[PDB]
């Protein structure tokens, strides 16, 4: 029964998508984006992100929300290869379009995932838009 043996990069993504309510830091996200420029780290980053989409639900919604934030950041700051890998898996993102959760006070939290998902899919389908967003990212 081995240990899951998370790599440093895998640990970075778990951290960037944990259940805390404050969001991954700028520098953590930047560090993950650098990982997308080599095969191994990028494969690990993609798998950890997409694991959250399938392994988490309900009251752990913020982890999905954060995974979507990470993904968006990587479209704007990561390798072109990473963006193509993400497109090939649009299906796994699209399934979240109907993510639903109502919290212990009546508030709709699933709507955060859904609008996030909707904007992410729009971005990915539009090469010109991605192009412009990567420009913006560099200036800033």
């Amino acid at each position: 029964s081995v240990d899951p043996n998370y790599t440093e990069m895998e640990g970075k993504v778990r951290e960037a998508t944990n259940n805390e309510p404050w969001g991954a830091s700028s520098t953590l996200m930047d560090q993950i984006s650098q990982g997308t420029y080599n095969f191994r780290e990028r494969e690990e980053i993609l798998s950890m992100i997409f694991r959250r989409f399938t392994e988490k639900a309900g009251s752990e919604w913020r982890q999905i929300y954060k995974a979507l934030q990470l993904l968006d950041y990587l479209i704007k700051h990561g390798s072109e290869r990473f963006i193509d890998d993400t497109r090939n898996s649009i299906n796994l993102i699209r399934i979240l379009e109907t993510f639903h959760y109502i919290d212990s006070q009546g508030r709709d939290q699933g709507i955060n995932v859904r609008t996030r998902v909707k904007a992410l899919i729009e971005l990915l389908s539009d090469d010109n838009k991605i192009r412009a967003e990567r420009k913006k990212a560099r200036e800033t």
Partner: protein, 95 residues
């Protein structure tokens, strides 16, 4: 001229990206990521500069024989970006 300044920027940028590409494989992974990410940005800068130069060549040069000469150069530069920057960069990012 603006054109000359664009071309100077282009050649400078092209040389830097090639140098970074040659140096990348011998850098540790942590540093190599940063290097390739910068080369990818420079690749985009080089294509944008071709667009910019083409616009400027069209506006500023009236000589039809000379404009042809510039066009061929831009076309050759486009091919150089593809073969000497984009392709080796993609290959490095892929393995």
């Amino acid at each position: 001229s603006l054109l000359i300044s664009y071309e100077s920027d282009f050649k400078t940028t092209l040389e830097q990206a090639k140098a970074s590409l040659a140096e990348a494989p011998s850098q540790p992974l942590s540093q190599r990521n940063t290097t390739l990410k910068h080369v990818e940005q420079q690749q985009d800068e080089l294509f944008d500069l071709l667009d910019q130069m083409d616009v400027e060549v069209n506006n500023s040069i009236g000589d039809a024989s000379e404009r042809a000469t510039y066009k061929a150069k831009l076309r050759e530069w486009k091919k150089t970006i593809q073969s000497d920057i984009k392709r080796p960069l993609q290959s490095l990012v892929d393995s």
